[PDB]
Amino acid sequence: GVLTESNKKFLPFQQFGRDIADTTDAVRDPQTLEILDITPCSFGGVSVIT
Amino acid sequence: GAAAYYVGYLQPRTFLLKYNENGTITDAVDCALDPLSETK
């Protein structure tokens, strides 16, 4: 996925966040304590015109 | 300083919180309090 700095707010005892369906949303690095949203890599479908 | 304290108990019961926009807790309901709560 792509690592984008987490604009949303955390709590002092909150290491990582999740939205739904096990899809972890945000994580804080275990060394410097910086918060980041993690978005799954952009993907789509491909169709043809013949 | 005269003090007052209260003692309550925790049970293994399912609670429905609403995680709000703040990453916080602002209200929740208990799935075993009353018949209506089971619906929620």
Binding site: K8, F10, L11, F13, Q14, Q15, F16, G17, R18, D19, I20, D25, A26 | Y6, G8, L10, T14, F15, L16, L17, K18, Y19, N20, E21, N22, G23, I25, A28, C31
Partner: peptide, 24 residues
């Protein structure tokens, strides 16, 4: 003694940050 505990007793049962979502 007896008193009615209205709404307290609620906390974060875990260490995961979940936002803007109902969760039971």
């Amino acid at each position: 003694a007896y008193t009615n505990s209205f709404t307290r007793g609620v906390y974060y049962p875990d260490k995961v940050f979940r936002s803007s979502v109902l969760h039971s």
